[PDB]
Symmetry: C2
Subunit: 485 residues, 2 copies
């Protein structure tokens, strides 16, 4: 494989994300051979660490993935560290020098990546300074990887965006959503555009409805401080869920390049219907988990650091609608929540049942294409066939496929994908501004009615699949969730 | 279950088919509760057997199909036997009498089924006398189950047809082909018409070619006497293969009633291209098996009873063409033979590859839907998805399904399915005159050039999938056998 020549600077280089996700990913790119001699990693944070202490930190964080000592040592010598106060303009001069020193040491020509893994208050500030203090390279590329969240409403986001646009063009910005980095999620376009039988049926004439489910068995754990102000709505729906929908609802692109893909996705989002108060009430459900069946499952209000009057949503179920011919009348059902029956990230495409009557007791039911993303990749197709009875009758059978052991071992972890893609300058698995702005516009309309408490807050017992209102939502259209736990 | 009131007479009631399959099947119908009290089975052959030894013959045969010995005995009590010579009109009175006795003893009002399980030469005769000697019931129905509808030649076949329509009404004729009775063959229509995504692609816009394979590992064994003049052409192609093609190539029927199904099938059969001499040479391959790698897999010309000059075909592969708008340009490849790599009856529908450019190393390949009929039922769908590599690329994966233990344990045997259907007077799974007629004309066109030795006789290693001329047939259209052995 060809060598990738880059200089990566991590803001927030001592946080857990960097320690357990980022460095090991970068190390993998090294093992694979993409990273060879012309590369350097400059870590930065507020604590007073130094080069020796940083290399040691890195060494410990990748010890579990090392083949041999020499390999780790060779890798480690490409890192350097600079303590740095993101608000201090002068501090940037120290960083600029570290970067230039590293660029000279390993002969790196531009190609800089700045990874922001710090509190979001600093996103705009760091951006402006990168330009001011002359940290941006004069040749090669300059790219910014921005960690979640990306604002907390359309306003904050737009504001963030405006700030970012001072030193970067939208196509150099890489907003991170690790679900877009999962292998199975990337199989969607292949399945659809690579098989005419599905490609031709990916529209309102064959699809009854689309279902997206991101369910977790865990509760609020120990992140109540942050979660209580975000809820399933901002933590799971606005970002992960919406971006998966984008892959599903997209129009057929001119070609498979990042530019056409985003264009194809943007056309769908532009057709997304934004709701008013009555509609949010009609099409969405918000709930909070109650007690379960064991002394481990406390109702949400009894969790650590959760205010006693909390009206936060730990579960959201809703219907999206697209004003594009392709999707006329096909509801996209979306759901995500904590304390549900199982851990599962999946997509289920329910096809309209056939009208040909066999004159049997059980006529043809709806076929279903299911793509399981988490916990283990699997694809299943529920099809109508003949029952094993004396009189002709139909039944539903499931053809299945699941990742092999070899598939698992060769699957790159999402952060490796993202970093590698950013190095290649491929925007295929990243959302662009148009996509993010629409998601915010859509979600704001919902939040607005929630904060004003203009919609019920349902309960559901820990261990189920949500409030009964969730089922009632699909029932109105003669639909039902295919995954029942 | 409802009790079925019927009287079934078996001509050839001491032959292998009766012993091994007919009797055990009727028994299954009894155990399942369809056959309760108002029923009788009258057997008949040349040999002078008495009620005791005949009942004993049935007992020996359903012995391993009985759980409770009591139900066995209770079943046995409904049988009666009469020695009878089919050619002597006089002895039909003995039969006629026996029939009436059993009818009055068990209170069966008409509803007679006559199963002709004897050599074909006798069918015409038995039919005429059934009407002549007044064996046909007064009230209820009268139905004929003809074991070998094709007869031994188009002429005799046509002749028998003549006799039958001049004495019986067509809805009383049940032309047998046990393959139509196989559970998986009956799933084909359910899969196609029961699923819009498949129903809509069942034509030339999506299908590249259809393959039908009926392979066997055994050689001629101890049937050289019959096989040497029949060959795979008459033994497997003319009958079983053709009936399967029928289910595949049929047009979409108006409804799922046997009348519309037959019309739909016939639209395909009448559109089948019958070949002249040049075309047989172009589209068909005949071959005879040579020695295998192992020891006792000797060449066909060395089997104990095969004449030195034998030019018999133990393998046929060919291309069928239907002149219907939905099948324009799609070849139907058929192959059947002895001493091939494995025992298998299956259909493989190859879909044209998509044309979407992913910009990958491996673009989309052809999807394939496979229906395994023997040894065990299975349905597989090879689809294009994403490979597990750093760069985006496609690969084919296989979604599969196979019959469960419960399914195969509740699956009726072909003969039970057929007898039951005849009782119900349902002709959907039986061959009709037009299909039988066409199959004959089709085959006779091929036999003519073969008996005139105007086409080559290929050789193939026993244990392989046939001569390479079989692969060349498909390669001419850029196709290849999916089943590799």
């Amino acid at each position: 494989v060809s060598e990738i020549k880059t200089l990566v600077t991590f803001f927030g280089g001592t946080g857990d994300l960097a320690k357990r996700k980022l460095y090991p990913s970068v190390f993998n790119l090294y093992k694979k051979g993409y990273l060879q001699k012309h590369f350097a990693i400059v870590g930065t944070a507020r604590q007073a660490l130094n080069d020796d202490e940083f290399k040691q930190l890195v060494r410990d964080c990748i010890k579990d993935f090392t083949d041999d000592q020499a390999q780790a040592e060779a890798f480690i010598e490409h890192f350097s560290y600079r303590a740095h106060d993101v608000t201090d303009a002068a501090s940037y001069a120290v960083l600029k020098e570290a970067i230039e020193e590293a660029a000279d040491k390993f002969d790196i020509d531009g190609n800089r990546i700045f990874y922001m893994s710090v509190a979001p208050r600093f996103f705009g500030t760091i951006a402006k300074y990168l330009k001011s203090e002359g940290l941006l390279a004069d040749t090669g590329y300059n790219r910014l990887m921005i960690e979640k969240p990306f604002g907390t409403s359309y306003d904050t986001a737009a504001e963030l965006q405006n700030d970012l646009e001072n030193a970067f063009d939208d196509n150099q910005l890489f907003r991170i959503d690790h679900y877009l980095g999962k292998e199975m999620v990337q199989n969607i376009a292949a399945l659809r555009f690579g098989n005419p039988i599905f490609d031709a049926a990916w529209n309102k004439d064959y699809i009854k409805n689309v279902q997206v489910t991101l369910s977790e068995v865990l509760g609020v754990e120990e992140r109540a401080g942050y979660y209580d102000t975000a809820g399933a709505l901002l933590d799971m729906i606005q970002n992960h869920t919406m971006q998966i929908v984008g892959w599903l609802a997209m129009e057929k692109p001119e070609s498979f390049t990042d530019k056409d893909i985003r264009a194809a996705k943007n056309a769908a989002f532009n057709a997304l219907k934004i709701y008013d108060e009555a509609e949010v009430n009609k099409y969405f459900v918000r709930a909070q988990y109650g007690a379960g069946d064991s002394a481990d499952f406390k109702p949400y209000l009894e969790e650590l650091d959760v205010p006693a009057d909390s009206k936060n949503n730990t579960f959201i179920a809703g219907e999206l609608q697209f004003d594009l011919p392709r999707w006329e009348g096909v509801p996209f059902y979306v759901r995500s929540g904590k304390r549900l029956a199982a851990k599962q990230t999946r997509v289920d495409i329910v096809f309209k049942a056939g009208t040909f009557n066999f004159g049997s007791e059980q006529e043809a039911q709806e076929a279903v294409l299911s793509i399981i993303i988490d916990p283990k990749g699997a694809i299943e197709l529920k099809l109508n066939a003949k029952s094993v009875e004396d009189a002709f009758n139909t039944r539903t059978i499931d053809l299945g496929w699941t990742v092999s052991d070899e598939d698992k071992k060769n699957t790159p972890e999402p952060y490796e994908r993202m970093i590698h893609d950013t190095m290649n300058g491929d925007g295929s698995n990243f959302a662009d501004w148009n996509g993010v702005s629409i998601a915010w516009k859509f979600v704001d309309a919902i939040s607005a009615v929630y904060t004003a408490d203009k919609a019920p807050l349902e309960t559901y017992k820990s261990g189920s699949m949500g409030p009964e209102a969730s089922d009632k939502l699909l029932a109105a259209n003669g639909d039902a969730w295919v995954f029942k736990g």
